[PDB]
Amino acid sequence: ARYHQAFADRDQSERQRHESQQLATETQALAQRTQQDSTRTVGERLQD
Amino acid sequence: VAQTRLYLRSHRPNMELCRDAAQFRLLSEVEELNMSLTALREKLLEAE
Amino acid sequence: PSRRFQLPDWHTNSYLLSTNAQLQRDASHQIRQEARVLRNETNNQTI
Amino acid sequence: REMEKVYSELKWQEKNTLEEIAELQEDIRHLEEDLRTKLLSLKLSHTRLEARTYRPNVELCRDQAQYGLTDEVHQLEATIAALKQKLAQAQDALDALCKHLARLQADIACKANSMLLDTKCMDTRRKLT
Amino acid sequence: HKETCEMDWSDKMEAYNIDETCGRHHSQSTEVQAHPYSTTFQESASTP
Numbered sequence A: 001a002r003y004h005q006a007f008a009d010r011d012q013s014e015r016q017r018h019e020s021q022q023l024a025t026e027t028q029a030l031a032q033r034t035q036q037d038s039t040r041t042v043g044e045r046l047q048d
Numbered sequence B: 001v002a003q004t005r006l007y008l009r010s011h012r013p014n015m016e017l018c019r020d021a022a023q024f025r026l027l028s029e030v031e032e033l034n035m036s037l038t039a040l041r042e043k044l045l046e047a048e
Numbered sequence C: 001p002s003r004r005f006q007l008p009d010w011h012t013n014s015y016l017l018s019t020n021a022q023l024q025r026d027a028s029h030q031i032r033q034e035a036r037v038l039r040n041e042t043n044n045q046t047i
Numbered sequence D: 001r002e003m004e005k006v007y008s009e010l011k012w013q014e015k016n017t018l019e020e021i022a023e024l025q026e027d028i029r030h031l032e033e034d035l036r037t038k039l040l041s042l043k044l045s046h047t048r049l050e051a052r053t054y055r056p057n058v059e060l061c062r063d064q065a066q067y068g069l070t071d072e073v074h075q076l077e078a079t080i081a082a083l084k085q086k087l088a089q090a091q092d093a094l095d096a097l098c099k100h101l102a103r104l105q106a107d108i109a110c111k112a113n114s115m116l117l118d119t120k121c122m123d124t125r126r127k128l129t
Numbered sequence E: 001h002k003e004t005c006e007m008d009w010s011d012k013m014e015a016y017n018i019d020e021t022c023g024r025h026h027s028q029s030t031e032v033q034a035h036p037y038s039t040t041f042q043e044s045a046s047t048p
Helices: A002-047 B002-009 B021-047 C007-046 D002-052 D064-124 E002-024
Strands: none
Touching: A002 B002, A002 B021, A002 E002, B002 B021, B002 E002, C007 D002, C007 D064, D002 D064
């Protein structure tokens, strides 16, 4: 049972690494896209 | 970045200040970054 | 346990942080006083 | 003893950085107000000159005041440019100060964790006596 | 009537200068500072 406890803790840890990696990548892409959209809108409001 | 952009756009004089699509994009950017920040904090707590 | 350090690096890091903070506070003070001088001169000239 | 000495020095530096950041923010606001005042003076000079251009024929003359108004307009433009440059420099300095404050805070937190660990070991070693 | 159009031109020029100052800012830009209350930076405005 103790070996089972250690193995399960390791498995939960590596699952959390995987999930955190996808969350960080998604948030970075989303922030870059929103900043580009804002800059383009500012340029259009300049030209009008 | 978005906070400073809103503060600088707030200084428009007399009639020129307007409810713009740029204003809508900036507000959406601010709230979306806030949501991403909250999720990233809860992931930091789970990692600890 | 890959990452390990040594004793003098800790002291050097603390000394480096203190020195960097002191120099940037001094630079900020200099910039503040130069800006005040510029404001006074420009106001006098415009009036 | 060594670790608590380092912690005390870190706390002192953090306090000084905080007060310096606040004073620099105050000076930045004052510079912005002076920029707005210079802008109002420029508007006044421009409207005075263009209103005085409305003189009728023959009387429309290059008097002594026109050169003074043009020279004043050029001086005000130079003043506006210099004030904008100094405002940018002040904002750069304040951003650098904020980054160093954040680094000092993180190092303070690490030192506090290490103090907690060492005093926990000291509290653990009482059974051996 | 020319003076009325002059006032309109002055307002448009100042909106232009403020919008260029806003559009200069980028991601790794050191002139950007924090400004907390976007609700206070938002003000009642007229439509484009």
